């Protein structure tokens, strides 16, 4: 079939009609980013010649090719630790949450470390981890436990001090006030949260529980990290298997050449294998450098998100998930990071009649903040991202100019307290 690009939606546009949400939901989405890849290393001389002296001596005639290849892979391995540190080691101190989690109804137990286990992973982190020749593999400087500990510090930091710990000392604040500031930061007044605090905490708690179900249920949920592992695993198997290719030589095995051919002829067959094996190794390294670059880019993005989505509140649309960003919580994953993005999403809009300004005593009044709306009989001024009608007063509006220069201005009363 010809693919659909999505359902059509005709917006009820007119010069005097505005839709304003009378309700909202809290949405939590999961974004997975690669941070690092396995730090492989291949010793060029051993890969090409093994323990054969006769081959090694011919490989020396190729100058520095092996030195360059060894340096390139070493440089990648070093980068991988840099990438991990840039993403996770953004906190000066290791912060811990209180034994008594009085967070105003907000339940963070699925993102905070689970103390009942030998591990220090949170319930969600356990889900993320459970399902994700001259050749050696080097261990990372920062082990999974250490990465989890950095993550815990970032979570504890955000929960108990909001963004202050990311720009100076950690300053404690009641969680509900932090959240009130986050609402204020997206154009929703603070009283909306306090009046609906029980609802918000419940919507939040439900959304986090949904993350566990999504990750548990969907096998492709972390394909982005699995793909990195599979691509590099395939590259190594491909690399090693080229040792079984003769590349035009009498055989793929150096020992079956040296024990079969007279030295001056054995030399030729070995050169055929050296060229082929060196070429296959160069191919591997070039691919690893290109892949290292895309991993680095992902790590840089992940590091940017850690700073802007976790250590602060972002005003960048769709940078920290869909909807109006409130806060984010990092979670450790194998060779990567998972961000749980908490956003505010308008839920139940209604059709209101609007106007640019209100005409009172021959003067035009505009909202200091908010928009003028009408329910069909009365005019109110309300905040833009949540319907909450107020009487139009001189403390809600400001006056500028006369009523003759505003197109669509309507007549109403502006109350003087």
């Amino acid at each position: 079939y010809t693919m659909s690009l999505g359902a059509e939606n005709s917006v009820a546009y007119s010069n005097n009609s505005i839709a304003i949400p009378t309700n909202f939901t809290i949405s939590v989405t999961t974004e997975i980013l690669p941070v690092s890849m396995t730090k492989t290393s291949v010793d060029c001389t051993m890969y090409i010649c093994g323990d054969s002296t006769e081959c090694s001596n011919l490989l020396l005639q190729y100058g520095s090719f092996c030195t360059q290849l060894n340096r390139a892979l070493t440089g990648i391995a070093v980068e991988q630790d840099k990438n991990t540190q840039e993403v996770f080691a953004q906190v000066k101190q290791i912060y811990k949450t209180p034994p008594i989690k009085d967070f105003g109804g907000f339940n963070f137990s699925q993102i905070l470390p689970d103390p009942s286990k030998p591990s220090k992973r949170s319930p969600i982190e356990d889900l993320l981890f459970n399902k994700v020749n001259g050749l050696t593999v080097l261990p990372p400087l920062l082990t999974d436990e250490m990465i989890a500990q950095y993550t815990s510090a970032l979570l504890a930091g955000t929960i108990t001090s909001g963004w202050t710990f990311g720009a100076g000392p950690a300053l404690q604040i009641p969680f509900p006030m932090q959240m009130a500031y986050r609402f204020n930061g997206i154009g929703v007044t603070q009283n909306v949260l306090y009046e609906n605090q029980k609802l918000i905490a419940n919507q939040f708690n439900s959304a986090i529980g949904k993350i566990q179900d999504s990750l548990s249920s969907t096998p492709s949920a972390l394909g982005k990290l699995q793909d990195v592992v599979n691509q590099n695993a395939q590259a190594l198997n491909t690399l090693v298997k080229q040792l079984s290719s003769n590349f035009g030589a009498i055989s793929s095995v150096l020992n079956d050449i040296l024990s079969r051919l007279d030295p001056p002829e054995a030399e030729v067959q070995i050169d055929r294998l050296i060229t082929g094996r060196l070429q296959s190794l160069q191919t591997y390294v070039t691919q690893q450098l290109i892949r290292a670059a895309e991993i680095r880019a992902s790590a840089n993005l992940a590091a940017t998100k850690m700073s802007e989505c976790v250590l602060g509140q972002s005003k960048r649309v769709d940078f920290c998930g869909k909807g109006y960003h409130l806060m984010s919580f990092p979670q450790s994953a194998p060779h990567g990071v998972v961000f749980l993005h908490v956003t505010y999403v308008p839920a139940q809009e209604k059709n209101f009649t609007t106007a640019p300004a209100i005409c009172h005593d021959g003067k035009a009044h505009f909202p200091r903040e908010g928009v003028f709306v009408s329910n069909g009989t009365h005019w109110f001024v309300t905040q833009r991202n949540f319907y909450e009608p107020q009487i139009i007063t001189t403390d809600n509006t400001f006056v500028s100019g006369n009523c003759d220069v505003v197109i669509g201005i309507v007549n109403n009363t502006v109350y003087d307290p």
Binding site: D43, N133, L236, N237
Partner: protein, 50 residues
């Protein structure tokens, strides 16, 4: 079947007609002893950078 490495007693069971085994990256990882018919694992001879 030639190479270098460290041979240890294995816990692998070969079929009666199999003489040696291989890994996913078609390299040898076990050999049958022609005289004892026991199976030994072959690990790489230790190496690494300093």
């Amino acid at each position: 079947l030639t190479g270098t490495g460290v041979l240890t007693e294995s816990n692998k069971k070969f079929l009666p007609f199999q003489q040696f085994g291989r890994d996913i990256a078609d390299t040898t990882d076990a050999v049958r002893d022609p005289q004892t018919l026991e199976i030994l694992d072959i690990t790489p001879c230790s190496f690494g950078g300093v």
